[PDB]
């Protein structure tokens, strides 16, 4: 006997042992009489058009694939629920927090960032940790990473960062010059790069890592009062990492290591679960916060802003078909129910456009009609109609315009947004020089110990040594600008790596 | 008080007066708070991307249209049933014919041929009369017209024909030189053209014209014995035509005359209906048939092959949403249930491929998962997976390959095709010189009376006068080949029209 | 001999008489050996798959259509040039106005609003008068109508307005209840409805109407100083209109009357031309203007803001292929060169998004690479890469990220936008009760004479009579709010129309 | 300094040192003023819709991906030429073989089979070796593999096989049970499976492997006489393989090993080349041939049918943009110039439909208009019009219908297909028990030595051990049927692997 993942078909057959196999039909429901030999003239003659059995199957085979995700293509998925355990209704009116003991179905996707569909699981990368809540006020998508922070803090750079992290356009190979020529030209990546190359760059499967919302968000309660917030869901199975040595072995011994581990855990009743916390910053604490509280390369320190528990995330169910239920999942940060609102984070504002945009391409204009994407615990009612591959009654014969004197849906005034006052020139403000070193300096000195600083510098050198000298030189100076000894240790190792 | 169609909204409100109007949401279910004023910074300030409510709706407004049908774009639709009244189980084992009193749900779409989606309903043009039978053996599409014949008999001439009947590629105007340059060079059109320029060329709506499969099909019974057949469905409401003068007033008075007629008819209870007949020809009779029995420009005369009644087509239901239920209708002549099979009719062979092909472009790769197109009375199970906009469970975790030791669907041997023997060179055979005037001579002399012959030439002459003279000369010569009087009457009128 | 449009094929053949016809190939460049008969097994046999000639052509026939414009679908196109004749460089620095005599290639598309591709040209409807200027600084699309104003003044009402002007979602029929339930509920439409229902509702083709940009636009000069402006391009052929009687005869005698008129004119050297004016309003005059100076339902009176000539628009070239040059034409109001900027106009703000959004759907992601859409007077260079159907080098092996130390394209600082100061609450402001009657009162009394006021009410009553009584009452009341005698005349004619 | 691939960006800069950097625009050509900072209201304010620069780059970054290939997704590409070195004009009249010394431009793509876009190069799999000749008679796509044979010999089983070779639908894990449940039920895979688990299962890059057209094809000379042939192109660099122990290291040390090798060879002037041979079998030798001469699991032994050399394949140019020139590459076995024609091979026949079908889905309706797929050395001319993303003049104002009197393209009678006589019942013929072991017995005993048989059995058992026992026993039985020591060796190793 083997692990449960390997016995999938075995169990599938056992769970059907009594009933008879179904009839094999065409996509049109017509039974086929033989699907192992083609319609031909004589045993050694040519194929016929009449054989619509071959065409109908071959045609659909020819149309299996869709465009993989432009980032976070390698994914693992599982389903479960979220349960409220504490009371934060003084901050947010969101139904998903309405009372202790309330559950909501969730869907999760774990992913790497750079690799394509076929890439190994056990590499050095950040990890996608997206969560879809199916609430009654519509869906809520918390599309977070395993990091509170990110490498850049203005969306316009994002296509550039991702191009630098993916394949050279001519050679179609990973390029350390592209990787580091960007990172060293944009030292705002100092805070996140440090995180990446330390021990938690390679987590041991998806159950031994935290998730963060990273952005600052806005909560809104029943009085109309608003605060800013951070989301942290911390692993109840404990932070556990892989060594460089063991990550590289598994990278060829089991390219689907994290996928397997997740499925096997759920299958044997070993259910992973996370603890959702929030931080809270008042509007007037945001005015005096020493950094930009919406800077995505910054955290809120725990001494001044402690973690306030909210509930538990539990995954207890495996997908049944991976394509339908994991590959077609779409998470839109702009899916926010009343009570949860975006901050002015320059990076979050961009993701409000990008995700629904890319989802209309990747999946199809009516991608929200796909079951796993469908807000199936709310009533979708509005004045949008048509589009390719319409799948419900298309809202019936309801009046399709607004306003109207025929009682088609109405707006709900309690769901209006919180109103903030803003004043300033409409222009492009330079954010390349917000404090790029301070919170990193703290991380290097005060969070890491002696050994971890050693391994941090070795991991950086072990990937920066393939970049040209003028690129190495500038990166080292950036590291020097956090701590002299930081750059020194990397520069001592690069002197050796260069022979 | 007005005709029922004009009161559509009025009635949608009355049928609802007992409820409260719904809540107006986004596509993602989120309630809208204001959908008449945009989110801007100051009363006379600019628009924000934070206004996702605008973008959600506008993005779907921008994607409302799909490609119109490349032919038969202007159409009318309704639903009803087919009911068996006579026994033809000796010829066909199809379940749709199984016993007397058997009902089957049907969908119908009426259409013109050349006009695009905005054209007028009351114009000279054939009429499409497509019927879809939702049988337990899968769907059956009988895609027929209002005429038993077509203008051509090889599918390689079809795109040409359509282009000649549509707009000038540079001026975008209907071009008489294109219509008649083609018809005069291809005299095999003389038959259908004579039908087209007769009174029936302009039916008084869709309820007063007959339907025809036109093609020769094949019927297989339970013993494996096969006959050839034609399908006729005649109007129970009686043939009734518009005159050129009335047709031209309605064309601007009410461009949607045949849509309004079909709708108000069903709404006011006047259910239209048709009587389905078949002709039968034995394989032997096919070998001695003077003409080619698979030549789409020939009828089987009624003296030699009388009409055998089958059942009743009835339309008793109006669509609730036009787009969802009529514009997305896709009829595939290749959808054939066991007991019905195609003949070698060259024109039917080409339609076996073309319709599914254009449905994957017009509607999409999985258009069969659109409700009206779904074989919702059959159990569709096979090894076809994925594709854009996949909407069921994608057949779940079932094994997706055949053969397989895990009891996925199995082929049904009794659904194999009838075996016919063919012999000959694989080679493009010339069919342009099959008899092109005999059956047209009979029609002119023995079906039409004098008045009708008189009008036939005036309708022809009124359109052919716009073609250059050398085209005129050639078309007249084709008509003289049918009957010298037929040609010389046309020519007498052209002599006048040419001043 | 006939008119030039109908002799189009005759000339094509004449223009080629010297040379010999090309070889018939497949889409892959393979010569065919017969394209009139299909490859079959014997003369009466079935069709084969290895007839790739048939497949290659039919599959492309099957994909001829794309989506028609969601609005303004019926159109006619021509090309020519714009010539500067006066110096407005003190208001704008745009290269298209650089010096007197500077010409710029243009492309113009005329259209109606509500009809679909097959509808008639001579109907009551606004007209689209779009102009594309191919300047050195990129393309400038001036997407203008034949009115200075529009029915609404918020873009959130557009989908609704167009829904109410189009077909009933269940009967697919034009619905006078929708039309006037909307207009009566939204009286802001009083101004444009009064234009629509007067003589110029039906122009005598596209060579006898004026063009307008309707929206306020911003002009910026070389010093950085801004002003607000309107564009008027008046016809040098003279205003000329059709009567209700002649418009309706021509709606069935020549559905393509405006297209033929334009084509014939150009083909006979009678080139139509238009005179481009601007109005100018300073930022100070913008604060004291009696109404909102960005309200699309308002004009700037000539006495206070006179016309300032600019140049000529001239159409002297017919399209060679209508589909490739007129149906694939794409205008974007967001295509604006340095010198010309949008005003805060709530309607124009939304056209900034809607058009590129719809163009990616209707045509494709890279619709800007289609010839007629291409800024072929400019040099495109940036960091945008790939997409469906990429057709040039894709910009080669150039670095695809920014910033870079590898001499990829750079920004141009002198192309930065003008800076304006805005202040106020970010909220959705009500514009429903902007003065809806004052400028209409002036039109009714001071611009129309006794005869024209008569016909204006008659045209209104003819169409408003078909709507329910409660909608009539409301609409008349909106007309009495302009002038008692305005609502009176309409009510006396409706009294008659209701028997 | 480093290898040439890593210095791609360095060199691109050097090759431009003399010029100035371009100007960064939008896609419409409009210059940008800053592309590092987003347009916001105040330094810490929300993003605006007015920021079209952001939308135009993000909207295109959201649509970068296209569906990877359904098979052979991981690939490597170059360009070069084919040169005729011998005369085979007595067999084929094709213009690519016209005279000794004639050159044709070619395009090659190497590829694995099962892995997706991100998998490793150095795995056990067959290798694609597609070749596209740009002929004056239109493209010729010789789409070969690195083996003369395949696992199956009917196309209906192909989706199944592939499904069995890829990922479990539920676990998204490679499944050994699936692999060998298929392979053991279908022992016609014995032949190719023995090829795959031998040394040549893992070639040392794409330059040290042969290429085979595999299928039997037809040649036709100028007299209309025809023969059958096999295409073998053998590596001029010599066969070279990797050991299991080196392939697994490289699989995590350089997943793109073969991609880097190809580029580095060409970039350093070391151009790889192949020698094209053919075998020939007369129509009369095909009749007596002991096995089915169109069976894709069978080779033509060299003693009886010796290689005849034809020409050289040389690759001497790297792609400049990988996506445009390698990812968008499209081969069609159906692209065949006069002189070359398909054999009745059941597999090949299916491939005549599949490839254009999937290319329309993957790339788009007009994929042949992409530069790298264009037949840019023939003149394409026909009656196919329009489609999404229409790019040339759409063939201008030419008559779009056939036949016509206006001198639009004409068919070429010399380009008709060779005529073969076929006879038999139209039915589905069972080919599952054509000889499945003979040629495999010959390979095991006569081609492999002692060591190689040893490594063959070790390779097979190492992967079959993970399959259930009832699958093991069957597969072993299929191996005993080739040779008792074959299935007994494998059984000895499995006995140990099962502890
Ligand atoms: N006739 C053919 O086209 C081929 C036959 N074979 C095998 O050879 C057997 C006998 O044919 P015959 O022509 O009389 O034999 P020959 O001795 O004439 O030729 C044997 C062929 O086998 C190839 N070969 C050698 N080792 C391997 C391996 N590990 N994997 C794959 N191919 C290999 C060689 O290709 P190379 O020239 O590259 O060394 C050679 O062309 C067949 O049963 C068949 O399995 C294999 C390939 C082609």
């Amino acid at each position: 006997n083997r692990d449960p993942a390997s016995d999938q078909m075995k169990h599938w057959k056992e769970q059907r042992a009594a009933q008879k196999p179904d009839v094999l039909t065409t996509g049109g429901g017509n039974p086929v009489g033989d699907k192992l030999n083609s319609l031909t003239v004589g045993p050694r003659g040519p194929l016929l058009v009449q054989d619509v059995v071959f065409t109908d199957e071959m045609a659909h085979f020819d149309r299996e694939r869709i465009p993989e995700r432009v980032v976070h293509a390698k994914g693992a998925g599982a389903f479960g629920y979220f349960e409220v355990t504490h009371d934060i209704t003084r901050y947010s009116k969101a139904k998903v927090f309405e009372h202790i003991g309330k559950r909501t179905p969730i869907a999760v996707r774990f992913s790497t960032v750079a690799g394509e569909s076929g890439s190994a699981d056990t590499v050095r990368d950040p990890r996608g940790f997206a969560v879809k809540f199916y609430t009654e006020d519509g869906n809520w998508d918390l599309v977070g990473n395993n990091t509170p922070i990110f490498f850049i803090r203005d969306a316009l750079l994002f296509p550039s960062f991702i191009h630098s992290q993916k394949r050279n356009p001519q050679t179609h190979l990973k390029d350390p010059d592209m990787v580091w020529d960007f990172w060293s030209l944009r030292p705002e990546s100092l805070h996140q790069v440090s995180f990446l190359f330390s021990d938690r760059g390679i987590p041991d499967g998806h159950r031994h890592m935290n998730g963060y919302g990273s952005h600052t968000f806005k909560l809104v309660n029943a009085n109309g009062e608003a605060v800013y917030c951070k989301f942290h869901y911390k692993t109840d199975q404990g932070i556990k990492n892989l060594s460089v040595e063991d990550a590289a072995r598994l990278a060829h011994e089991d390219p689907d290591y994290g996928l397997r581990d997740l499925f096997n855990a759920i299958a044997t009743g070993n259910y992973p679960s996370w603890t959702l916390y929030i931080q809270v910053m008042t509007f007037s604490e945001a005015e005096i916060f020493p950094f930009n509280p919406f800077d995505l390369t910054k955290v809120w320190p725990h001494g001044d802003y402690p973690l306030i528990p909210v509930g538990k995330l539990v995954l207890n169910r495996n997908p049944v078909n991976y394509f339908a239920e994991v590959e077609q999942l779409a998470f839109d940060p702009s899916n926010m129910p009343p009570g949860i609102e975006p901050s002015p984070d320059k990076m979050l504002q961009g993701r409000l456009f990008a995700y629904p945009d890319t989802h209309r391409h990747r999946l199809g204009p009516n991608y929200l009609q796909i079951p796993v994407n469908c807000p199936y615990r709310a009533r979708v009612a509005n004045y949008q109609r048509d589009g390719p591959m319409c799948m419900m009654d298309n809202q019936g014969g309801a009046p399709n315009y607004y306003p109207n004197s025929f009682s088609a849906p109405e707006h709900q005034p309690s769901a209006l947004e919180h109103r903030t006052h803003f004043s300033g020139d409409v222009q492009r403000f330079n954010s390349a020089n917000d404090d790029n070193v301070t919170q990193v300096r703290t991380f290097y000195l005060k969070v890491l110990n002696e050994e971890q600083r050693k391994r941090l510098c070795e991991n950086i050198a072990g990937h920066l040594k393939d970049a040209q000298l003028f690129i190495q030189k500038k990166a080292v100076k950036n590291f020097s600008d956090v701590h002299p000894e930081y750059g020194s240790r990397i520069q001592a190792l690069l002197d050796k790596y260069n022979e």
Side-chain angles (χ1 to χ4, degrees), chain A residues 164-168 171 173-184 460-468 471-472 475:
Chain A
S164 66
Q165 287 295 114
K166 293 188 104 84
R167 300 169 167 260
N168 179 279
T171 73
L173 300 162
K174 306 285 188 181
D175 198 333
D177 268 15
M178 284 168 63
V179 162
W180 286 101
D181 178 29
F182 189 80
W183 273 346
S184 66
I460 285 171
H463 188 283
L464 174 62
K465 62 131 166 72
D466 289 311
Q468 281 187 84
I471 298 170
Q472 300 165 10

Side-chain angles (χ1 to χ4, degrees), chain A residues 3-6 74-78 110 121-122 127 203-209 235 237-238 240-242 250 253-274 315-319 322:
Chain A
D3 57 353
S6 311
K74 186 71 188 302
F110 297 106
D121 264 355
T122 60
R127 293 291 190 289
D204 183 19
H206 302 303
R207 296 172 312 118
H208 298 272
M209 74 208 194
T235 177
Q237 295 70 222
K240 195 181 172 183
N241 297 296
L242 288 167
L250 292 162
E253 240 172 14
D254 186 6
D256 299 336
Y257 173 80
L259 199 47
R260 182 184 305 277
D261 176 85
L262 179 64
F263 188 101
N264 272 342
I266 293 171
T268 58
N270 197 22
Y271 301 144
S273 68
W274 284 256
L315 304 175
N316 65 12
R317 184 160 60 103
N318 285 324
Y322 174 95

Side-chain angles (χ1 to χ4, degrees), chain A residues 38 57 62 77 110 112 148-149 165 187 189 280-281 324 330 356 438 472 483:
Chain A
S38 292
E57 189 182 18
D62 287 353
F110 297 106
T112 47
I149 52 175
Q165 287 295 114
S189 61
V280 166
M281 178 181 283
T438 299
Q472 300 165 10
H483 196 245

Side-chain angles (χ1 to χ4, degrees), chain A residues 26-322:
Chain A
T26 60
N30 302 145
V32 289
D34 198 292
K35 211 192 70 73
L36 307 178
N37 296 286
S38 292
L39 198 65
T40 65
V41 188
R44 292 170 181 196
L47 180 77
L48 297 184
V49 183
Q50 261 172 229
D51 200 337
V52 300
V53 168
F54 166 80
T55 308
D56 193 278
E57 189 182 18
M58 187 59 52
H60 211 265
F61 178 74
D62 287 353
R63 301 177 172 69
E64 283 190 5
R65 303 294 163 266
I66 66 172
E68 74 166 34
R69 288 162 175 83
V70 64
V71 285
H72 298 257
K74 186 71 188 302
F79 295 82
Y81 65 84
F82 166 70
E83 186 175 321
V84 188
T85 61
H86 288 85
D87 188 336
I88 60 155
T89 55
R90 68 191 182 259
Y91 300 118
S92 166
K93 58 163 170 161
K95 283 181 154 87
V96 67
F97 307 121
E98 218 169 28
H99 51 85
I100 301 180
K102 182 173 189 173
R103 299 201 178 177
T104 299
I106 66 174
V108 175
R109 198 190 185 82
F110 297 106
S111 60
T112 47
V113 184
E116 294 85 1
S117 295
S119 52
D121 264 355
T122 60
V123 283
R124 176 158 273 110
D125 269 339
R127 293 291 190 289
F129 188 179
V131 181
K132 174 183 297 299
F133 304 79
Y134 304 93
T135 83
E136 300 91 307
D137 267 347
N139 290 353
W140 175 33
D141 281 332
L142 184 58
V143 195
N145 277 341
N146 82 330
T147 327
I149 52 175
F150 201 58
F151 309 86
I152 56 159
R153 59 182 167 247
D154 187 330
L156 271 164
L157 274 63
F158 187 83
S160 285
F161 173 59
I162 298 301
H163 288 181
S164 66
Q165 287 295 114
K166 293 188 104 84
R167 300 169 167 260
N168 179 279
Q170 167 164 39
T171 73
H172 202 52
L173 300 162
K174 306 285 188 181
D175 198 333
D177 268 15
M178 284 168 63
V179 162
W180 286 101
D181 178 29
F182 189 80
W183 273 346
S184 66
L185 287 165
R186 301 299 306 207
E188 60 258 47
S189 61
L190 270 159
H191 207 172
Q192 174 53 16
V193 160
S194 300
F195 282 10
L196 184 62
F197 283 86
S198 65
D199 292 344
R200 298 182 189 189
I202 315 174
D204 183 19
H206 302 303
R207 296 172 312 118
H208 298 272
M209 74 208 194
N210 289 341
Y212 304 78
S214 30
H215 292 296
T216 294
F217 291 93
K218 210 207 304 184
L219 301 180
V220 175
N221 74 11
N223 286 331
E225 294 159 352
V227 292
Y228 292 116
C229 75
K230 298 278 194 185
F231 295 104
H232 312 232
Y233 27 120
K234 293 203 181 186
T235 177
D236 305 353
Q237 295 70 222
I239 289 300
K240 195 181 172 183
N241 297 296
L242 288 167
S243 61
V244 172
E245 189 169 4
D246 278 319
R249 195 188 78 245
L250 292 162
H252 77 273
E253 240 172 14
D254 186 6
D256 299 336
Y257 173 80
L259 199 47
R260 182 184 305 277
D261 176 85
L262 179 64
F263 188 101
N264 272 342
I266 293 171
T268 58
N270 197 22
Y271 301 144
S273 68
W274 284 256
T275 308
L276 187 66
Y277 302 83
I278 65 173
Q279 298 174 277
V280 166
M281 178 181 283
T282 65
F283 268 49
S284 57
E285 287 177 303
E287 287 308 271
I288 68 141
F289 189 57
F291 317 101
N292 177 6
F294 315 135
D295 187 328
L296 186 55
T297 69
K298 304 289 175 298
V299 300
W300 299 357
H302 292 139
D304 284 313
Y305 298 89
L307 296 167
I308 294 162
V310 184
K312 295 262 174 169
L313 305 168
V314 182
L315 304 175
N316 65 12
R317 184 160 60 103
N318 285 324
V320 176
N321 174 284
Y322 174 95

Side-chain angles (χ1 to χ4, degrees), chain A residues 420-449:
Chain A
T420 321
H421 177 82
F422 291 106
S423 185
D425 298 314
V426 164
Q427 64 172 330
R428 307 178 172 270
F429 294 94
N430 193 20
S431 71
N433 274 270
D434 297 31
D435 186 329
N436 300 321
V437 300
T438 299
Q439 293 200 336
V440 197
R441 193 177 294 130
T442 295
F443 177 68
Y444 186 76
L445 290 172
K446 267 67 157 79
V447 178
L448 301 183
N449 61 23

Side-chain angles (χ1 to χ4, degrees), chain A residues 381-383 402-404 407-416:
Chain A
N382 52 27
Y383 299 84
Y402 188 78
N404 53 79
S407 308
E410 298 284 340
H411 59 282
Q412 191 190 89
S414 61
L416 260 159

